[PDB]
Structures are given as C-alpha cells and as structure tokens.
RNA sequence: CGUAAAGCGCACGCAGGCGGUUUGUUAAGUCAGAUGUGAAAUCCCCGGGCUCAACCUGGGAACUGCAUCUGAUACUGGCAAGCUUGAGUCUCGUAGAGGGGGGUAGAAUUCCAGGUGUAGCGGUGAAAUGCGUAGAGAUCUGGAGGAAUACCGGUGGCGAAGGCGGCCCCCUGGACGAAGACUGACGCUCAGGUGCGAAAGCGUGGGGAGCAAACAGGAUUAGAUACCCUGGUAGUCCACGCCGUAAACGAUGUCGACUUGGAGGUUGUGCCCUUGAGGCGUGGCUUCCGGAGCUAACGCGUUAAGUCGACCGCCUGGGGAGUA
C-alpha cells in the first residue's frame, strides 16, 4: 500500500513521463523533496515545488528533450520488503558513468558520484538514467 | 440497526459530549450494544449465517479497537471493559 | 489573424485523443479546432514548403474523395506540383519501380490516342481501349512526368490517406498534411489542424499551397 | 502461475512480515576511520633455482571475514508528543432475487368424486408394452395434495464465495450517496487456526404432485447391459445433524497508488425560465469496443493480463499420482 511512498513517486514520474505529461504531483515528505532535489540538480526533472502547508504537495515539472523524456528508466532498489545498504567501495555506478544512483547517507540524500567523493555510503534509494 | 435514540444515548454516556461520536470508547460501546442485542436475533434462527458475518465483523472490529485503546490509554481501557462488562 | 471564412473546426465524437492540443471545441456535440493555432502552422506549412519549393518544388498533392477530387486537378495540379486525385494504388511510392511501367503503358497509348494507331483496329478496341485509358488516366495523372523525385507531399485528410502517408513516413518524404480532429497526427511532420472535407478548407489551404509553390524564386 | 507446470471454493483473523505524515530524542540496524586479528601452505602478481617444463623457492598481493574503540544521524528500528489526507465512528436517505422466520396467492400437473359423452386414447422415426365398455381419452363441475413460481425479466439487481426470482409482514447483514461533526495511523496482508461452502451422498422422523438414478417392460440393433417408448424405487421437498467436494472458472489471491479514448446499462446526488418528455455536472456498480503498453500467440487494455509496491497461496518434464 502507501507502505512504500518513494516507489510511488518514482512511478508517478515513470508513468506521467511515458504519458508525455507536463507536471505531476503527490503528497510531499521531507524525504521525497531531498530526492527531487537531486533529480533537479542532476537535470532529470525540470523543477519542483511544494505547494502546501498542513497537507503538503510536492509537485514536479518533467522535461522532454528530443522527442523522448529525460528519464529513460527509473527503478526502485531498496524497499520496505528488502532494504539495500552498500558501503562505499561497493557503491553502484549506473550506465557505466551516465545516469545516477540516489543514495541516502549519514549526511543527506546524494548521488553515487557525490557520495563516492564524500567518502561514505548508505541506503541506495533508487537508480535513474 | 440500533435506535438513533439508543445510539445517541451511548454517545452521551461514553464520550466528552454528544458529537464526540468517534471517541474510541464510544465505538467500542455501541458495538458492544449491538453485538449483545443481536445475540437474541441469532438465538432464534441460528441459520442466518449471512447476517452472522456482520456480527463476527462487529466483534473483530471492536476487538481491534479495544486492543488499540489498551495500547494508548491502558486506564481508559480497564475502565471501559469493566463498565461495558466484558473481557472476563 | 484568421482568414478561414468557414472551416472553423469539424467532426464530432470520433475525435482522436492526440488531437487535443489543437482543439478548443464544444459547439453542439462537435469540436471547433484551435482557430488560432492552425495559423502559426501556415508559418512552417507554406514556409518550409516554399523553402523546399525554391530549392526546387516537387510536391504530389495527394487527395481523394468523389467530392473534392477534381478540385485538386488545378493550380495544385498545374504549377510546380503533381497530384493524385483517386484511389491511391498502394505501393505507388513504395513500388515506384513497379508502376513505373504502369506509366509507360499510359503514355504508350495516349501517345497514340490522337497519335499513332487509333481509328484503325476494331471499332471495338477504340473506347474499348480508352476504357483502359480513362482508367489508368485517373489514378496516375500527377505521375505522368515525374522528373524530380516526390519531395514532400501535400495530403488532404491524414487518416483517410492511411497508406500514402505511411508510405512516405517509410521513404523520407516530409508529408505536409491537414488533419481533422478525428484524424491521427504524428504521421504528419507538418501538421495542419482544422476541417479536411468541406469544399473550403480544401480550396483555401489547397489553392493557397499552389499559391506559394507556384512562386518562391520568381 | 488467464489459455503451457502453477492463485487455497470463499471469508475472518492470532503469530509474523510490511506500514501515511511532523518534531524531538535514541543510536540497535546502516555508514565512517582507527586498531587488533584473519596460522603456514595454496591461489594470483614480479622475480630466483633445476638443460626446458612439470617441480623448488624469495617477496608482495590477496584472505571479499571477524572483533574493539571513536565518530557520522539521511534511511530503518526503539522512546515521546503530535498531525489529518489512510481507517473508523455519528446524521439523514437510496437501490437491491443479500440472509433467517411466519403467512399467503393464482396457473398448471397428478389424483378423488360427479354430470355429459363413446370407442378409442396414449406414444414413436415406425411401433409395441401401457391405458379404455368396471366407460378411458375429450368436455364441464367440485375437492384433496405436493412442487415450482409464467408475464415483469433485461451482458438487469444483491452476496465473501457457494449462490439468491410470486405477494405480504416480522427479525437482520452489507453496499452507496449528500452534507458536515467526532476518533486520530486505530492500517494492509496473514503460515498455523476458525467459519462458510453447489449438487450428489449418509443419519432419524416427516412429506411425495412432477421429474427420475436403480429396476421392470416394449423397441432399435450384428450385438444394445444405451440413446427412443411404457412403468418406476431411492433421491429431488421440510426439520435436526452430517459430509467439506465441482470446469467451487474471470480456469486471473488480496490491498493500495499511478497511466489516452468511445458507445451503453444500472444506481445515488448538486446546480438551470424544474416551465421539454429535460439541460450541464458529480460518485458507486456494470457491458461492449479500443490506444499506448504488455503477451508465444490468442488476446488483456483505468473492472489490466499496463506502470509500481506490501503481504500470502502455489509451479519446477510426461506418465506413475493427487496414487502408496
Ligand atoms: Mg493449467
Ligand atoms: Mg516516512
Ligand atoms: Mg594464509
Ligand atoms: Mg627460468
Ligand atoms: Mg525515526
Ligand atoms: Mg388446480
Ligand atoms: Mg378439476
Ligand atoms: Mg439495511
Ligand atoms: Mg458447513
Ligand atoms: Mg442436498
Ligand atoms: Mg434424507
Ligand atoms: Mg425412462
Ligand atoms: Mg480440489
Ligand atoms: Mg465464470
Ligand atoms: Mg479465486
Ligand atoms: Mg472508457
Ligand atoms: Mg477490449
Ligand atoms: Mg497488476
Ligand atoms: Mg487420497
């Protein structure tokens, strides 16, 4: 159910994107945001927005480049059934180097590139490319 | 299915005021009330399996509620089961 | 900005979902297109049309329906452009090298209608070979001389031209088409919203295409 | 795991697994560095020694592990207090073959009685068994009895599945809708467990019109332990209690989120000179068709067999065997 909301986010992108849908919204959370952040900073989403207060409302702008969408694939990795935790030497690099891996760490939701530099590791939320 | 008169009664017997309809105790109480009433319905008949399903439903619900209470306010729990007269 | 006296929109339920971005309709259980979006598409329509027409325009005004056909055998036909105004013999772009000989027959026949052999053979063979001609005549006029490969294609009703567009899509032939609310776009590189089968939207944009291929480099 | 092996017939629900949202705290999981340890040989890397090699050997590297200390706090778990969208509770109503109990109605069949009537009726492909002069069938009249409820009736409606159709009262389950109010994550799923669960069949009494396993008789047929005909017992009906299986099928487990359309059916409800028998919306349920997509194909397609998550059942060649 609502039990895993991050996969729900991942999928609302995945879906709307394949639906050539301009925006897409969803109930917000601290967590959710910190990710969209990374998605934006790495140029997969266009721009996010949290239009709420009591009942927060994370909202994202999808991009489309050529004819495609910018997100060729968005999978969950960790999940409440089975949590994944890679050290640092073990951090997974997506599409060789292209595309990213969203990982939470003792210091915030970063990208595998970033986390690798940081010198740390953590829960590898999802993969994007 | 329980009298608006009677259901109201109990709301005003277990909650803050009437309107405090969803107060735990109040649910647990007007469930109890029906569950008990019903025991005579199914005293005759007994072959009314279908209706029985709602009654089981009733019990398992009130049970979950009763559980949750004990988890929160163990005081309001004991008070309630004494005063509703169950849990032996 | 509009010019279309009356092509407004057209076509009722049968709308194809993908034709949303070019519709603002609602009148009486039929949608009017986006009057003001058809237009910035004449920008690009006749533009990259005339753009290739100067660099040398070889068009192919593909359009059919016994109620609009002959109204393409005109300045559409006449000027720098060629036309098909009947049943689109499937594979005529895609089998151009099979059909090429369906031309040699047409000529080698009319080139011998008032020429060569004719009033001889039987008084049977006569219009009993112009039944051959009248046939191959329609469906295979605008083929006649081809000279400079089919290069873009102007097509009347996108889906009613299922085949010819698809053919082009295959062959690298930019397909300029006007696509009703009901017709399926995206087969069309240069998409022209609005009505497709009212005697106007045709002649209008139709004759207005002739009127830009016809002249581009003097 | 729709049709190839594979979703328990269905439901509730303990353990367990999973769990919306904010803040604080915790620091077990997780992450970091340090330190110790992880025997030698082996394996691998670069050399060296036997005429080469196999073989021998120096040195690194590796031993992906464990443990202790110290730190990091995003995620997970613990603790605390919240929050309102998830989930419940309350008010009014709507549709309904939802369940249980008691009444009751007309149409028919069979039977009993009688009137009239008289030589056949019945049945098949053709016949015969059968029935009729103790008068059949036919026809009219009255009566008894059980069983099922024409027309409405409809890809109509309800239920968890099984399944539930005359009318009425009584008891009762669920669903949905319009508002607003209260509870405040109280939830999802569920091995074990419990309940329900067509028809057949079993136990005791009862009931028995029609149908009909068995059985008898007549036929057909090379044969006919059948299909057809004349009869007809159990059973089919009620009460109590068993049994627990069906192609128990959508051959598709439940819950939740997301993703173009079109024409109906059904059922609530808001708004418009109600001024059209309506007009524009907005929920629940459903049928056909169809896009992406998915698929071996067939096909599925917002009621997914699409895109995702939580949990559970189950599959691992055919036969043997759902057998011992
Ligand atoms: Mg199978
Ligand atoms: Mg959370
Ligand atoms: Mg060693
Ligand atoms: Mg050597
Ligand atoms: Mg926490
Ligand atoms: Mg009678
Ligand atoms: Mg009678
Ligand atoms: Mg009710
Ligand atoms: Mg049972
Ligand atoms: Mg039975
Ligand atoms: Mg019996
Ligand atoms: Mg018989
Ligand atoms: Mg079975
Ligand atoms: Mg079925
Ligand atoms: Mg099933
Ligand atoms: Mg639809
Ligand atoms: Mg379909
Ligand atoms: Mg699915
Ligand atoms: Mg057995």
Swiss-Prot record, chain A:
Q: Which Gene3D superfamilies match?
A: 3.30.1370.30, 3.30.1490.10
Q: By its UniProt entry, which InterPro entries does this protein fall under? A: Ribosomal_uS8, Ribosomal_uS8_CS, Ribosomal_uS8_sf
Q: Which Pfam families match?
A: Ribosomal_S8
SUPFAM superfamilies in the record: Ribosomal protein S8 (SSF56047)
Q: Which GO terms describe its biological process?
A: cytoplasmic translation; regulation of mRNA stability; regulation of translation; ribosomal small subunit assembly
- Please verify whether the record's keywords include Ribonucleoprotein: yes
Q: GO molecular function of the protein, one example?
A: structural constituent of ribosome
Please provide the record's keywords in A-Z order: Repressor, Ribonucleoprotein, Ribosomal protein, RNA-binding, rRNA-binding, Translation regulation
> What is one term from the GO cellular component aspect held by the record?
cytosolic small ribosomal subunit
Family affiliation: Belongs to the universal ribosomal protein uS8 family.
Describe the protein's quaternary organization and the partners it interacts with: Part of the 30S ribosomal subunit. Contacts proteins S5 and S12.
Q: Which NCBIfam families match?
A: PRK00136.1 (NF001109)
Say what the protein does: One of the primary rRNA binding proteins, it binds directly to 16S rRNA central domain where it helps coordinate assembly of the platform of the 30S subunit. Protein S8 is a translational repressor protein, it controls the translation of the spc operon by binding to its mRNA.
HAMAP family on file: Ribosomal_uS8_B (MF_01302_B)
Q: Know the name of this protein?
A: Small ribosomal subunit protein uS8
Source organism per UniProt: Escherichia coli (strain K12)
UniProtKB/Swiss-Prot annotation, chain B:
The record's annotation in SUPFAM superfamilies points to: S15/NS1 RNA-binding domain
Q: Can the keyword Ribosomal protein be found in this entry's annotation?
A: yes
Induction per UniProt is: Part of the metY operon that extends to pnp, also has its own promoter.
Q: What SMART domains is this protein classified in? A: Ribosomal_S15
GO terms assigned for molecular function: rRNA binding; small ribosomal subunit rRNA binding; structural constituent of ribosome
- The membrane spanning regions, by residue number, are none
Please give the InterPro entries that the UniProt record associates with this protein.
Ribosomal_uS15, Ribosomal_uS15_bac-type, uS15_NS1_RNA-bd_sf
> Which keywords accompany this UniProt record?
Ribonucleoprotein, Ribosomal protein, RNA-binding, rRNA-binding, Translation regulation
Q: Which BP terms does GO give this entry?
A: cytoplasmic translation; regulation of translation; ribosomal small subunit assembly; translation
Q: Which family does it belong to?
A: Belongs to the universal ribosomal protein uS15 family.
NCBIfam families, sorted: S15_bact
Subunit (UniProt): Part of the 30S ribosomal subunit. Forms a bridge to the 50S subunit in the 70S ribosome, contacting the 23S rRNA.
Recorded protein name is Small ribosomal subunit protein uS15
Q: Which organism is it from?
A: Escherichia coli (strain K12)
**What lineage is on file?**
Bacteria, Pseudomonadati, Pseudomonadota, Gammaproteobacteria, Enterobacterales
UniProtKB/Swiss-Prot annotation, chain C:
Q: Which GO terms describe its molecular function?
A: structural constituent of ribosome; zinc ion binding
The coiled-coil regions, if any, are none
Residues bearing PTM N6-succinyllysine: 107
Q: Pfam families in the record, alphabetically? A: Ribosomal_S2 (PF00318)
| UniProt cross-references to InterPro entries, sorted A to Z | Ribosomal_uS2 (IPR001865), Ribosomal_uS2_bac/mit/plastid (IPR005706), Ribosomal_uS2_CS (IPR018130), Ribosomal_uS2_flav_dom_sf (IPR023591)
Biological process (GO) annotations? Answer: cytoplasmic translation; ribosomal small subunit assembly
* Stored Gene3D superfamilies: Glucose-6-phosphate isomerase like protein, domain 1 (3.40.50.10490), Helix hairpin bin (1.10.287.610)
UniProt keywords (A-Z) are: Ribonucleoprotein, Ribosomal protein
Q: One Gene Ontology cellular component annotation?
A: cytosolic small ribosomal subunit
The record's similarity note reads: Belongs to the universal ribosomal protein uS2 family.
Q: How does it assemble?
A: Part of the 30S ribosomal subunit, contacts bS1. Some nascent polypeptide chains are able to cross-link to this protein in situ. In collided ribosomes contacts ribosome rescue factor SmrB.
PANTHER family found in the cross-reference section: 30S RIBOSOMAL PROTEIN S2 PROKARYOTIC AND ORGANELLAR, SMALL RIBOSOMAL SUBUNIT PROTEIN US2M
Role according to the record: Required for ribosomal protein bS1 (rpsA) to bind to the 30S subunit.
Its recorded name reads Small ribosomal subunit protein uS2
User: What is the organism field in this record?
Assistant: Escherichia coli (strain K12)
Gene field: rpsB
């Amino acid at each position: 159910s609502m039990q895993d909301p991050i996969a729900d986010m991942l999928t609302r992108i995945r879906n709307g994107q394949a639906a050539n849908k301009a925006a897409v919204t969803m109930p917000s959370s601290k967590l959710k945001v910190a990710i969209a952040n990374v998605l934006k900073e790495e140029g997969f989403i266009e721009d996010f927005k949290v239009e709420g207060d009591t009942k927060p409302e994370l909202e994202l702008t999808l991009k489309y480049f050529q004819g495609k969408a910018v997100v060729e694939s968005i999978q969950r990795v960790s999940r409440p059934g089975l949590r994944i935790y890679k050290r640092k030497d073990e951090l997974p690099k997506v599409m060789a180097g292209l595309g990213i891996a969203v990982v939470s760490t003792s210091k915030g939701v970063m990208t595998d590139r970033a986390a690798r530099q940081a010198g740390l590791g953590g829960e590898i939320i999802c993969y994007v490319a | 299915s329980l009298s608006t008169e009677a259901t109201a009664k109990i709301v005003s017997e277990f909650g803050r005021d009437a309107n405090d309809t969803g107060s735990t105790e109040v649910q647990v109480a007007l469930l109890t009330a029906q569950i008990n009433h019903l025991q005579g319905h199914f005293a005759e008949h007994k072959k009314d399996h279908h209706s029985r399903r709602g009654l089981l439903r009733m019990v398992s619900q009130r049970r979950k509620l009763l559980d949750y209470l004990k988890r929160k306010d163990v005081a309001r729990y004991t008070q309630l089961i004494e005063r509703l007269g169950l849990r032996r | 900005m509009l010019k279309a006296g009356v092509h407004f929109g057209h076509q009722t339920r049968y709308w194809n979902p993908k034709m949303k971005p070019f519709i603002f309709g609602a009148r009486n259980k039929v949608h009017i297109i986006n009057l003001e979006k058809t237009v910035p598409m004449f920008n690009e329509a006749l533009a990259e049309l005339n753009k290739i027409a100067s660099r040398k325009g070889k068009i192919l005004f593909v359009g059919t329906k016994r109620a609009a056909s002959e109204a393409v055998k005109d300045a559409a036909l006449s000027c720098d452009q060629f036309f098909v105004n009947h049943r689109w013999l499937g594979g005529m772009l895609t089998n151009w090298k099979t059909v090429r000989q369906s031309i040699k027959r047409l000529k080698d026949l009319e080139t011998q209608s008032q020429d060569g052999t004719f009033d001889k053979l039987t008084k049977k063979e006569a219009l009993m070979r112009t039944r051959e001609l009248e046939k191959l005549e329609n469906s295979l006029g605008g083929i006649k001389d081809m000279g400079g490969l089919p290069d873009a294609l102007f097509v009347i009703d996108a889906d009613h031209e299922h085949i010819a567009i698809k053919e082009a899509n295959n062959l690298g032939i930019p397909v300029f088409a006007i696509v009703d609310t009901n017709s399926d776009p995206d087969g069309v590189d240069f998409v022209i919203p609005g009505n497709d089968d009212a005697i106007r939207a045709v002649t209008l944009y139709l004759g207005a295409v002739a009127a830009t291929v016809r002249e581009g480099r003097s």
